[model samples]
Target: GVLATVDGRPITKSDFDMDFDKLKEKEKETLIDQAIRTALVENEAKTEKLDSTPEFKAMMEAVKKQALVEFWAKKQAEEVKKVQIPEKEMQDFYNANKDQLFVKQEAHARHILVKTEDEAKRIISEIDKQPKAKKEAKFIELANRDTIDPNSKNAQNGGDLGKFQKNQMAPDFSKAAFALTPGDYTKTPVKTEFGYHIIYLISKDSPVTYTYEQAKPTIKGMLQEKLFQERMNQRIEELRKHAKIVINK
Candidate 1:
């Protein structure tokens, strides 16, 4: 039943198994590392006559309380059940969020990414002077050859950012990208943290609302999560009121 002693206290098989079960594979490795460190600390503190200090005692007490709270909190979360959302409730949620849920103003834009502001300016001048289709094709060809972004796999297809929102891109990039009308490009280089960019706006959306049917599944999941949280809070309050929990020193 007992294997060995730590600081004159018996280490039981039950104690080892309980602690081990609480850990995952990676966590078990971390636990072993922590035990080795703790043993060294315990030995050093014993040698320095610091083991009986009031600070050490208080620290140990805090660790015990923290462990108890973690275990109880996990058990409380596990006890909460998934709540169901009715069709009518789902419809109501969809109605409230339809405008907000769908993607906002996004543009299908193209660019010619170059090393310097001068290079971007030169390309922009050429684009402004050339016919629209020819200019776009030329930009795509140049980007394919010279763009630096490792994820510039789309550079061959005219450096397409492919319908992104305002918050998705860098502020200056978004500003230049969003301000342009369809079939327009920045006349001057747009300076961003990632160097100078020449942006062209292919198209922009006017922001449309979705039908309830289109958003039903997502709305159901959202409503279920919200309802479950409310129910779980109420259940915990009831449990706390009925339980007789006491702390003894």
Candidate 2:
């Protein structure tokens, strides 16, 4: 059924349904009202010859210029060859930046999350009652059963978050996680906006060193981006020199 119309242009149920399904019922009414208003304004613009106004013409020209520039930039980037970083160059970069870049610490960890503080505390108590050697296995069991995190992929594999550097986790969670030694779990629940978490630290690594091979791809990407910008700047300068440009302000 047609829900509404502007200037004899039909607004159908299908059209409203397409845009409104993801919106709340309250939000849908406001959006439909705005759409009707926009259609009416557009109709009036045509009738009043507003599209031919100097301001509208100027706005259109500016938009077209921006689109042309984006198209040209995309073509220029596509034309640039992929930059490569040789093993020796990567090694050199690593050596020069080792003190600054290689000092980050990371952890491999797992956790179980629950909604309530009491639930988190209860799990912690249960895990603590197990022998130190058995705690990790027990923690994995509980995580698979209890965690509500939608992003958890490895709950069956022990809720492993793999390796991550500091600041990768929520501030409080990261602080508590990084404070623990390998094979240790927090004795108390760590609370964050998500919920209470019982974090288990599987391993900790420090001053992470990347071999030349390991670092080559990243180095190549960095070098490639730099070359792209340099090429773009040179091309822009050449174009500017050949073209007549005026600034009104």
lDDT (C-alpha, whole model) for all candidates: 0.70, 0.79
Per-residue lDDT of 118-213 in model 2, one digit per residue for the tens? 999999998989998899999998888888776663447667788887645666788788879889899999999989999999888774666656
Question: What TM-score does model 1 achieve against the real structure?
Answer: 0.42
lDDT of 2 at 18: 21
Quality of model 1 by C-alpha lDDT: 0.70
Q: Which number leads on TM-score?
A: 2
The parts of candidate 1 lying over 4 Å away from their true place are 1-103, 153-155, 207-249
Clashing pairs in 1: none
Q: How high is each candidate's TM-score?
A: 0.42, 0.43
* Per-residue lDDT value at 242 in model 1: 94
